Amino acid sequence: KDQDDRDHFGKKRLDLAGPLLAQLFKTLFKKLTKDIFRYMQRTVEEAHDFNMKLAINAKTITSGLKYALATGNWGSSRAGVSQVLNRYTYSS
Amino acid sequence: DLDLERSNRQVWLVRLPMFLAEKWRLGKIRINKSKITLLLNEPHEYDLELTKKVVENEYVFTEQTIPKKTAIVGTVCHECQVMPYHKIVEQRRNIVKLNNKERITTLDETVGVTMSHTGMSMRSDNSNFLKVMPKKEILDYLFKLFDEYDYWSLKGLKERTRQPEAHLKECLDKVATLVKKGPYAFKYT
DNA sequence: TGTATGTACAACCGAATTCGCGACATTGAAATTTTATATACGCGCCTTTTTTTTTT
DNA sequence: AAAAAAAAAAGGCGCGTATATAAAATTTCAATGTCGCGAATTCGGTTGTACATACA
Numbered sequence: 479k480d481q482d483d484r485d486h487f488g489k490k491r492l493d494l495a496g497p498l499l500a501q502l503f504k505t506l507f508k509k510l511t512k513d514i515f516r517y518m519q520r521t522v523e524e525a526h527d528f529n530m531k532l533a534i535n536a537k538t539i540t541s542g543l544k545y546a547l548a549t550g551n552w553g554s555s556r557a558g559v560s561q562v563l564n565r566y567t568y569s570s
Numbered sequence: 571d572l573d574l575e576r577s578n579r580q581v582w583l584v585r586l587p588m589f590l591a592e593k594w595r596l597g598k599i600r601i602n603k604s605k606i607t608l609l610l611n612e613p614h615e616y617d618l619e620l621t622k623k624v625v626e627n628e629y630v631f632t633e634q635t636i637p638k639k640t641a642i643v644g645t646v647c648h649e650c651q652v653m654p655y656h657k658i659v660e661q662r663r664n665i666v667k668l669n670n671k672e673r674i675t676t677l678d679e680t681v682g683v684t685m686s687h688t689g690m691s692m693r694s695d696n697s698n699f700l701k702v703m704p705k706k707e708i709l710d711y712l713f714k715l716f717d718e719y720d721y722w723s724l725k726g727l728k729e730r731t732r733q734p735e736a737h738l739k740e741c742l743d744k745v746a747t748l749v750k751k752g753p754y755a756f757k758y759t
Numbered sequence: 760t761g762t763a764t765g766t767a768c769a770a771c772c773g774a775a776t777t778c779g780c781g782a783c784a785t786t787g788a789a790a791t792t793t794t795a796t797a798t799a800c801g802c803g804c805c806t807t808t809t810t811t812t813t814t815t
Numbered sequence: 816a817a818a819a820a821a822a823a824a825a826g827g828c829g830c831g832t833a834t835a836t837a838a839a840a841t842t843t844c845a846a847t848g849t850c851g852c853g854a855a856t857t858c859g860g861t862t863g864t865a866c867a868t869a870c871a
Contacts, residue, residue: 521700528700531689750784751850 498559499543502552506542513538572640579644581630585621585651589662614655622649703733705740712741712758720759722746727758 493501514533521528546552550559564570586594598609599618606618630643654663677684695701711731715722724742728735742748746758 522702525702527702755850 574642580647703737708737708741721757
């Protein structure tokens with residue numbers, strides 16, 4: 479048998495927006511899971527009062543995506559994935 | 571102390587499709603010589619197919635380091651699987667290939683009502699979740715606790731005597747052995 | 760003829776000894792504490808009132 | 816039909832909001848202030864063989 483061609487197009491996949499958001503979302507969701515846990519841990523460890531809005535920092539996600547769209551920076555670790563759209567002429 | 575009940579109880583393990591095994595969590599074997607069949611108990615009529623004629627090195631045991639009450643039931647006599655009446659079994663089989671699962675309930679309310687809540691709903695703690703001395707009298711009590719206990723701890727004396735701390739220590743300073751070093755630390759004997 | 764003796768000069772070994780972080784205790788203090796009085800609102804809670812429901 | 820009991824509800828009531836004042840007595844608290852803990856460090860005694868050498 480021959481050496482595998484590593485470029486046969488079938489061995490490619492295209493991480494379109496969907497799977498890409500998954501990456502971005504999934505990891506960013508961890509940053510939520512850890513943090514509440516952290517604060518949760520604190521309030522008990524100091525018997526403070528369990529409030530929800532302090533417990534979950536919403537920005538953790540919204541700020542994450544909005545940024546990571548706004549520039550193709552994707553974490554860093556990757557760039558060139560988000561552009562301004564090109565509205566020169568329809569075909570463009 | 572392993573026990574061998576029979577090790578020879580001839581048994582025919584079977585593999586099954588999902589529905590009947592699920593229905594199995596009786597019948598009548600109509601062997602036909604070897605087109606073995608089975609008349610189930612009402613329901614369908616599923617014959618016997620000989621998945622493996624001869625079955626070896628495989629036996630049935632039981633359970634009740636730590637050993638446990640283990641017995642040897644018997645040897646697998648012959649393996650079978652099942653031929654599943656048929657078209658309905660065929661229909662449900664192809665029908666079984668048509669599962670589904672939930673999508674997302676968007677929120678049909680307009681958004682102020684949905685969004686006023688997760689901010690300042692004005693209502694809090696709806697749920698319970700992690701809601702968290704005389705010089706004479708002091709001396710007599712200090713002598714008593716020291717008489718009661720040589721290891722009459724000072725703060726424990728203060729908590730128990732329920733007297734001002736300064737008065738209790740003064741009582742224990744002369745009526746008790748003021749020990750702040752050594753193995754019996756914080757013990758007033 | 761077997762033995763007792765002084766002394767060596769070299770590699771091995773373990774034995775015994777003194778330095779800073781954490782535990783709290785320290786006293787220092789503020790905060791809270793209780794009281795009158797007008798003001799008004801808005802907590803909750805008291806009793807009563809009325810109503811409703813049940814049974815005979 | 817009537818009595819009777821059960822229940823809801825209504826309303827005013829008290830000092831938890833504000834504020835100023837004093838009184839004092841408690842409580843809690845924060846800011847350093849002394850106590851062990853494991854690591855860090857240096858000294859000679861023992862032993863074996865040589866080698867000369869002398870009494871039993």
